[PDB]
Design an enzyme around this catalytic site. Structure first.
Site, PDB file in Angstrom:
ATOM      1  N   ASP A 195       0.826  -1.203   0.000  1.00 14.87           N
ATOM      2  CA  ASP A 195       0.000   0.000   0.000  1.00 14.87           C
ATOM      3  C   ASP A 195       0.861   1.254   0.000  1.00 14.87           C
ATOM      4  OD1 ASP A 195      -1.932   1.892   0.289  1.00 14.87           O
ATOM      5  OD2 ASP A 195      -2.413   1.407   2.390  1.00 14.87           O
ATOM      6  N   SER A 244      -0.869  15.685 -11.900  1.00 13.21           N
ATOM      7  CA  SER A 244      -1.126  15.339 -13.289  1.00 13.21           C
ATOM      8  C   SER A 244      -1.379  16.603 -14.094  1.00 13.21           C
ATOM      9  CB  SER A 244      -2.327  14.390 -13.362  1.00 13.21           C
ATOM     10  OG  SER A 244      -2.750  14.152 -14.691  1.00 13.21           O
TER      11      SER A 244
END
Length: 330
Positions: A35, A199
């Protein structure tokens, strides 16, 4: 040194991925959920409340000649999906894909929430976010990666998750045969303890690319792609009959649909998520309403590039002095 381990979807939907991890002496192999959105290595154990164990493999520290109680240390964690676990702490030898760390903090669960109990395939979590998020008290502990880093050939790990197929976690090297083209690297903020990046935009299907900054985290422990409501609405508007259902808990779509792809930007580069990756199947057995793999982050407080996004790429988690993230197509 290096390590290389195969990671395998737990079910036909790729809800999560498990990777075998050797703990203790002699080795006890547990299948852990790696994770990159958390920083605790915790396991089902011989200390876990018996009624909360249902099929998992447990770590038994009394059977490990290298286990030592970390006296006074406790841990307690709550995840974004509302699940939780807590317990005490041992140090022991932990190996992943041939890479060994001695003195790793292994957090032994005394209690786990129902979602963990109900998932027989996940024996615990191995956190790969920054150690500043580790929950051990009163002495915070380091992640497996943080402990291994100085010994690694290069201070990196990579995630290469498969779509309905196994993939690979590598430590200490970049497998140049595992991706196509070049890797585009992008800046990371560690301020919140995550692999947080921005992004450069998105496209829906064959549509034009929208240049817009989307801050979010690269999180292998989250199944879906969680993005701003504007972006998610633009995606689902291209699917006839798709709608947001408050009763179901997100966007659903007719199972008869063909889903468009979704592209996200990494600098000037582009990663394309095929439409099929966005199908999470019937909302309940036999239903013709299917659950979407792109969902709104509104009210999470952060955008999450979970498995839906990451499995479309070869992803480099660069833990150099100034960390960065790399993405390549594959």
């Amino acid at each position: 040194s290096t390590g290389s381990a195969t990671t395998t979807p737990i079910d036909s939907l790729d809800d999560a991925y498990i990777t075998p991890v050797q703990i203790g002496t002699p080795a006890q192999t547990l299948n852990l959920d790696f994770d990159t959105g958390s920083s605790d290595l915790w396991v089902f154990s011989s200390e876990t409340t018996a009624s909360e164990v249902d099929g998992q493999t447990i770590y038994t520290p009394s059977k490990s000649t290298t286990a030592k109680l970390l006296s006074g240390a406790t841990w307690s964690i709550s995840y974004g999906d509302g699940s939780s676990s807590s317990g005490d702490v041992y140090t022991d030898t932990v190996s992943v894909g041939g890479l060994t760390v001695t003195g790793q903090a292994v957090e032994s669960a005394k209690k786990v929430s129902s979602s963990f109990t109900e998932d027989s395939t996940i024996d615990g979590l191995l956190g790969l976010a920054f150690s500043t998020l580790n929950t051990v008290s009163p002495t915070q502990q380091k992640t497996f990666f943080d402990n291994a880093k100085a010994s690694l050939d290069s201070p990196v790990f990579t995630a290469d998750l498969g779509y309905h197929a196994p993939g690979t976690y590598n430590f200490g090297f970049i497998d140049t045969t595992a991706y196509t083209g070049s890797i585009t690297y992008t800046a990371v903020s560690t301020k919140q303890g995550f692999w947080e990046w921005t992004s450069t935009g998105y496209a829906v299907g064959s549509g034009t690319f929208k240049s817009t900054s989307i801050d979010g985290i690269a999180d292998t422990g989250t199944t879906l792609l969680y993005l701003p409501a504007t972006v998610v609405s633009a995606y689902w508007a291209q699917v006839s009959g798709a709608k947001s259902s408050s009763s179901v808990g997100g966007y659903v779509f007719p199972c008869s649909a063909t889903l468009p792809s979704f592209t996200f930007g990494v600098g000037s580069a582009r990663i394309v998520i095929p439409g099929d990756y966005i199908d999470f199947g019937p909302i309940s057995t036999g239903s013709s309403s299917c659950f979407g793999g792109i969902q709104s982050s509104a009210g999470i407080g952060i955008n999450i590039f979970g498995d839906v996004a990451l499995k479309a790429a070869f992803v480099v988690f660069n833990g150099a002095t100034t960390p960065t993230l790399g993405f390549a197509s594959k």
